[PDB]
């Protein structure tokens, strides 16, 4: 079968993701572990994800996000939001796990051939006083949702594409949507 690639590719623009250095205090709502290349966040809350490039991509560039199951045995299964959480910013499809917060230009796709879900936004260069571009994502199911992930790990793949859909870059990270991201990250790093 065919599955979405997760191969890292910096490409022509030196594209890679970055995350805030948030730490693991109990007050955190989103925190990234570099050692595990894993983002820990709460249900539907803001997840800042940074786009870092070495040179500016051309006008019309787009940034797409898609989720896939991490385990080989579940990778051909389309990642969708569970029925419970499906049943709303009025822009995102109810069955999509990943939404973009704070961007009216977000476009959602149900692939006509693979049936996979993704959300894409226009790439914008860093604002004045910043060296990266930040997109706010929201995950609409817990890793534990029996009706969807059911504790099966998932990866978010972020791809940079030109206006015509050509691949410019790719990066990815595992994601755990949970009640206590700080505590969960700290505990998972204890195995190291
Ligand atoms: Ca990376
Ligand atoms: Zn759910």
Curated annotation (Swiss-Prot):
Changing residue 157 to N: In sporadic cancers; somatic mutation. Changing residue 11 to C: In LFS; germline mutation and in sporadic cancers; somatic mutation. Changing residue 54 to N: In sporadic cancers; somatic mutation. Changing residue 165 to H: In a sporadic cancer; somatic mutation; requires 2 nucleotide substitutions. Changing residue 63 to D: In sporadic cancers; somatic mutation. Changing residue 174 to D: In sporadic cancers; somatic mutation. The chain holds residues 95 to 289 of 393 of the full protein. Changing residue 189 to A: In LFS; germline mutation and in sporadic cancers; somatic mutation. Changing residue 126 to H: In sporadic cancers; somatic mutation. The lineage of its organism: Eukaryota, Metazoa, Chordata, Craniata, Vertebrata. Ubiquitous. Isoforms are expressed in a wide range of normal tissues but in a tissue-dependent manner. Isoform 2 is expressed in most normal tissues but is not detected in brain, lung, prostate, muscle, fetal brain, spinal cord and fetal liver. Isoform 3 is expressed in most normal tissues but is not detected in lung, spleen, testis, fetal brain, spinal cord and fetal liver. Isoform 7 is expressed in most normal tissues but is not detected in prostate, uterus, skeletal muscle and breast. Isoform 8 is detected only in colon, bone marrow, testis, fetal brain and intestine. It comes from Homo sapiens. Changing residue 54 to V: In sporadic cancers; somatic mutation. This is Cellular tumor antigen p53. Changing residue 29 to I: In a sporadic cancer; somatic mutation. Changing residue 68 to N: In a breast cancer with no family history; germline mutation and in sporadic cancers; somatic mutation. Changing residue 115 to I: In sporadic cancers; somatic mutation. Changing residue 95 to K: In a sporadic cancer; somatic mutation. Changing residue 37 to I: In sporadic cancers; somatic mutation. Changing residue 38 to M: In sporadic cancers; somatic mutation. Changing residue 154 to S: In sporadic cancers; somatic mutation.
